[PDB]
C-alpha cells in the first residue's frame, strides 16, 4: 500500500539517521537524565572548570567558545550531508541544487539536533563528553553572552513536543528538501520528494503521537521558527565579524555564510 511504503520510507530515514549521527536524542536524554552507564559528562560551569575541561574533553574564552561551536558546526555539516545523501532521490538531483539545499538548510538542521542535546540548564558537547551550563554561556562578555540564548529558548519549547529520533529523521528530511531555497535550478523534483516526505511525516506523527493534537501543524511552524533562528544567528555573526578581527572562519562555514 501507499501507506505501507510511507512507513518503509520512515524506517529507511531512521536507519540512515542512526548511521549518520553518532549522538542520537535517545542516548542524549539518557545522559541528561542521568541514566547512562557510560562516563558522565564533565561539567563546565565557570572559567576554572572550562580550564579543567580543556584537558578532559591564546584567544580569550569568549572567542574560544564561539569558535568551538563553529568547529562543531563544521562536523555537523558533514554528518548532515551524509544523511541528505540517503534521502531517496537526493543524489539524483542536479548537483548544484544539492549544494544549494545544504547551503541554505544545514543550520536549520543543526539547531534542530542541538535541541536534542539541550535542557533548560545546559547543553552536551563533544558527543556527551562535556556539559556546558546555559548560565555560563550567557555570562560571556558581549556579544558572545547572547549567542545561544535564542537556541536554548527554541529547544525548551521544541523538546516539550517530545519527538523521538524516528520523528526527527523525517522532520529533518522535509526541511532539507525545501523547494523555496534561493537559486534552485529544478524545483519540481525537489517538491515532489518533499511532498512524499511530508506525507510520511504526517503518518508518522499520527501513529507515534495519536493523542498529540495538531502535532503536524506545530512542526510545520517549527520549520518557520528555525529559519528565524538562523536569520538572527547570521545577523549576530555580521555583528561579530564587524568588531571581532583576527577571527578566522573555517572555509566550510565561509562557503555556507557567503551570499547568505
Amino acid at each position: 500500500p501507499e501507506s505501507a511504503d510511507l512507513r518503509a520510507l520512515a524506517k529507511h530515514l531512521y536507519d540512515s539517521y542512526i548511521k549518520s549521527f553518532p549522538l542520537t536524542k535517545a542516548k542524549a536524554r539518557a545522559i541528561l537524565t542521568g541514566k547512562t552507564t557510560d562516563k558522565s559528562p564533565f561539567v563546565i560551569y565557570d572559567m576554572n572548570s572550562l580550564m579543567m575541561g580543556e584537558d578532559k574533553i591564546s584567544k580569550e574564552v569568549a572567542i574560544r567558545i564561539f569558535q568551538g561551536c563553529q568547529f562543531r558546526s563544521v562536523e555537523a555539516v558533514q554528518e548532515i550531508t551524509e544523511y541528505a545523501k540517503s534521502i531517496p532521490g537526493f543524489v539524483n538531483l542536479d548537483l548544484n541544487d544539492q549544494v544549494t539545499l545544504l547551503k541554505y538548510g544545514v543550520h536549520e538542521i543543526i539547531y534542530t539536533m542541538l535541541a536534542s542535546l539541550m535542557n533548560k540548564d545546559g547543553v552536551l558537547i563533544s558527543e556527551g563528553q562535556g556539559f556546558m551550563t546555559r548560565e555560563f554561556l550567557k555570562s560571556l562578555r558581549k556579544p558572545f553572552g547572547d549567542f545561544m540564548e535564542p537556541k536554548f529558548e527554541f529547544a525548551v519549547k521544541f523538546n516539550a513536543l517530545e519527538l523521538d529520533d524516528s520523528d526527527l529523521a523525517i522532520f529533518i528530511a522535509v526541511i532539507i528538501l525545501s523547494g523555496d531555497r534561493p537559486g534552485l535550478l529544478n524545483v519540481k523534483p525537489i517538491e515532489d520528494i518533499q511532498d512524499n516526505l511530508l506525507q510520511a511525516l504526517e503518518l508518522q506523527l499520527k501513529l507515534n503521537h495519536p493523542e498529540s493534537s495538531q502535532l503536524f501543524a506545530k512542526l510545520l511552524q517549527k520549520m518557520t521558527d528555525l529559519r528565524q533562528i538562523v536569520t538572527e544567528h547570521v545577523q549576530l555573526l555580521q555583528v561579530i565579524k564587524k568588531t571581532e578581527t583576527d577571527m578566522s572562519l573555517h572555509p566550510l562555514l565561509q562557503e555556507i555564510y557567503k551570499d547568505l
Binding site: 545523501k85 545544504l102 562557503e255 555556507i256
Partner: peptide
C-alpha cells in the same frame, strides 16, 4: 566548492 566535494565522496 567544499560542499560539492563532500557530496561527491561515496
Amino acid at each position: 566548492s567544499l560542499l560539492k566535494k563532500l557530496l561527491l565522496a561515496p
